[PDB]
Amino acid sequence: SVFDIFELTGAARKGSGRRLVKGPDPSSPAFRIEDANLIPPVPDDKFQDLVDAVRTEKGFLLLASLRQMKKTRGTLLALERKDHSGQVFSVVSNGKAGTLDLSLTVQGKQHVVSVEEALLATGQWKSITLFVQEDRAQLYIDCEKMENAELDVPIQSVFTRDLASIARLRIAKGGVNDNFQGVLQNVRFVFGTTPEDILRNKGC
Amino acid sequence: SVFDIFELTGAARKGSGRRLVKGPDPSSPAFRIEDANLIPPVPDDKFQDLVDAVRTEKGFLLLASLRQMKKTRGTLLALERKDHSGQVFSVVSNGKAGTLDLSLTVQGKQHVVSVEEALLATGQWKSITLFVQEDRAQLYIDCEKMENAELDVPIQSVFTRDLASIARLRIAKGGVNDNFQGVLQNVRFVFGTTPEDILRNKGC
Numbered sequence: 001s002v003f004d005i006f007e008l009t010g011a012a013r014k015g016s017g018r019r020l021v022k023g024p025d026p027s028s029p030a031f032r033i034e035d036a037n038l039i040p041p042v043p044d045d046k047f048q049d050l051v052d053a054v055r056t057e058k059g060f061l062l063l064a065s066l067r068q069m070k071k072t073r074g075t076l077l078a079l080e081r082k083d084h085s086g087q088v089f090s091v092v093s094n095g096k097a098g099t100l101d102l103s104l105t106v107q108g109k110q111h112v113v114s115v116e117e118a119l120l121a122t123g124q125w126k127s128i129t130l131f132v133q134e135d136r137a138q139l140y141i142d143c144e145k146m147e148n149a150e151l152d153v154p155i156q157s158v159f160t161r162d163l164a165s166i167a168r169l170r171i172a173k174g175g176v177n178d179n180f181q182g183v184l185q186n187v188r189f190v191f192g193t194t195p196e197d198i199l200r201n202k203g204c
Numbered sequence: 205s206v207f208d209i210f211e212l213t214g215a216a217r218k219g220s221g222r223r224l225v226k227g228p229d230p231s232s233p234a235f236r237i238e239d240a241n242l243i244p245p246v247p248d249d250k251f252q253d254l255v256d257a258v259r260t261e262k263g264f265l266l267l268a269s270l271r272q273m274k275k276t277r278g279t280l281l282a283l284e285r286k287d288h289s290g291q292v293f294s295v296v297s298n299g300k301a302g303t304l305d306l307s308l309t310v311q312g313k314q315h316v317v318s319v320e321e322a323l324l325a326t327g328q329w330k331s332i333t334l335f336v337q338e339d340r341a342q343l344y345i346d347c348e349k350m351e352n353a354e355l356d357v358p359i360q361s362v363f364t365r366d367l368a369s370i371a372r373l374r375i376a377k378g379g380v381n382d383n384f385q386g387v388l389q390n391v392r393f394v395f396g397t398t399p400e401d402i403l404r405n406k407g408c
Contacts, residue, residue, distance in 0.1 A: 012226060020224040020233070022216060029224070029233070 003050050003189040005077060005171050006031060008042040016040070018172075023185035024065055024125050030185035036075075036173035048164040053191045058156050059133030061190045062091070063198065066128070068121045068182040071095045075174030077187060079158070079167045086110075087175055088167050089158045091130070095121025100130070100139055104151060104158050111152040115139045118147055125183075127202065131195040140195060143204035207254050207393040209281060209375050210235060212246040220244070222376075227389035228269055228329050234389035240279075240377035252368040257395045262360050263337030265394045266295070267402065270332070272325045272386040275299045279378030281391060283362070283371045290314075291379055292371050293362045295334070299325025304334070304343055308355060308362050315356040319343045322351055329387075331406065335399040344399060347408035 006012070011031060012020065017038030023030025033039075042050070054060050068074050078090035092101040098121075099114035115137060120126045131138040135151040171187060172180035190198070210216070215235060216224065221242030227234025237243075246254070258264050272278050282294035296305040302325075303318035319341060324330045335342040339355040375391060376384035394402070 012230075014226050022218050026216075 001191055003046075003053070003191075005042060005169065005187045005189070006184075008046045008169075009040045009171060010043075011039055011171070013040070021183060023183070024127070025186055028186055030065070030183050031172075032183045033172045033180050036170070036179040039171060039173070041080075042169040042171075044164050044168070047169050050169070050189055051159050051161075051163050053189070054159045055156055055161070057133070057191055058154070059131070059136075060155075061193055061195060061198065062128075062130045062132070062188070063190060064128050064130075064187045065125060065185040066093065066120060066180075066182060067123070067125050067184075068093055068095060068180065070121050070123050072121060072181045073174070073178050074121075074180030074182065075172060075178040076180060076184070077169065077171045078173060078175070079163070080170055080173075081167050083166075088163075090174070092174065092178060093118075093120040093180075095119075100128070100147075102132075102137060102149065102151065104153055104155070106153050106157055109153075113137070113149045113151060115147045115149045117145075129195050129198050138195060140199055143199060143202055146195075205395055207250075207257070207395075209246060209373065209391045209393070210388075212250045212373075213244045213375060214247075215243055215375070217244070225387060227387070228331070229390055232390055234269070234387050235376075236387045237376045237384050240374070240383040243375060243377070245284075246373040246375075248368050248372070251373050254373070254393055255363050255365075255367050257393070258363045259360055259365070261337070261395055262358070263335070263340075264359075265397055265399060265402065266332075266334045266336070266392070267394060268332050268334075268391045269329060269389040270297065270324060270384075270386060271327070271329050271388075272297055272299060272384065274325050274327050276325060276385045277378070277382050278325075278384030278386065279376060279382040280384060280388070281373065281375045282377060282379070283367070284374055284377075285371050287370075292367075294378070296378065296382060297322075297324040297384075299323075304332070304351075306336075306341060306353065306355065308357055308359070310357050310361055313357075317341070317353045317355060319351045319353045321349075333399050333402050342399060344403055347403060347406055350399075 018031040129140040222235040333344040
């Protein structure tokens with residue numbers, strides 16, 4: 001029902017890619033990224049559960065609290081091929097374009113869509129609620145007007161049955177100079193819940 | 205019933221005397237001390253509650269997980285006079301003597317007792333359970349033989365009705381070069397519970 005990515009990676013391990021810091025959630029640890037390459041990937045079996053949940057729902061709700069350096073491109077999370085030939089999926093807070101970029105690669109074909117009006121790199125804590133279902137993307141920043149975008153392919157087409165055997169979930173690690181610069185907290189995949197239910201318990 | 209000192213001080217505040225790190229308790233934050241002087245004292249009202257609990261019980265059970273530099277003297281916690289003329293109470297892991305020193309000052313008269321056979325400064329995580337009642341002190345390190353010591357005065361005689369108005373609870377801050385050097389976690393005063401109940405749920 002709820003997959004906190006940092007928890008899964010076991011992210012809290014002494015000084016391996018990040019510094020444990022303060023977050024807007026007094027009850028959870030926040031990580032200031034230092035070397036995303038060192039933050040361990042989500043374990044295969046623990047990733048396999050996410051895959052199935054996504055496949056059951058034909059989508060997911062992703063929540064995240066972030067504090068990102070201005071005008072930078074930071075990968076929130078990505079699915080990288082075990083062979084290292086690239087990524088099959090990624091979510092990037094693009095501070096250069098003022099967007100949240102969603103990339104999906106379906107056997108060679110990579111498709112990228114930008115959710116416009118998404119300034120998440122304003123050096124302060126921001127919280128996002130991204131709802132994805134089939135080929136539809138809905139984004140809510142804090143308590144603001146929702147932004148929408150269409151995927152050229154259904155999200156589940158990326159989350160194949162065997163995905164965990166050929167790819168792994170990484171957090172804060174990008175492709176071309178896209179590692180996340182800043183602080184991340186409660187990056188979680190929530191299932192069996194629509195976006196309204198969530199914003200309903202943030203001042204709105 | 206339970207007073208976690210770091211929580212009370214609001215100890216978790218961005219980089220004010222300590223670095224948030226890993227502890228043997230996966231569910232709680234551990235603090236590596238950097239400048240105890242900057243770790244805020246326990247708020248008066250929140251301290252007033254501790255005082256009354258101690259006064260009701262005529263003692264307390266103190267628990268603590270610590271990782272202390274070898275052969276150093278580190279104050280785990282202390283009650284310092286608001287006027288700055290000294291301490292009225294202190295608990296010191298004395299790595300030089302291999303003891304846990306308990307100091308109590310009752311109007312000028314300072315009394316110090318050492319709980320012998322207490323090597324807590326062996327550079328590794330150690331956990332302590334100190335039970336104090338009236339003038340009796342009992343210490344249990346991890347799951348080891350208990351050590352005992354007698355106080356020249358009842359513990360409640362230090363915890364007067366008005367103590368919170370003339371003194372404040374500090375953590376990791378000592379008197380004569382006694383700041384704690386290392387990492388501290390779950391330093392808590394537990395009430396309405398005897399020591400056995402505690403060790404009963406650590407492998408012993």
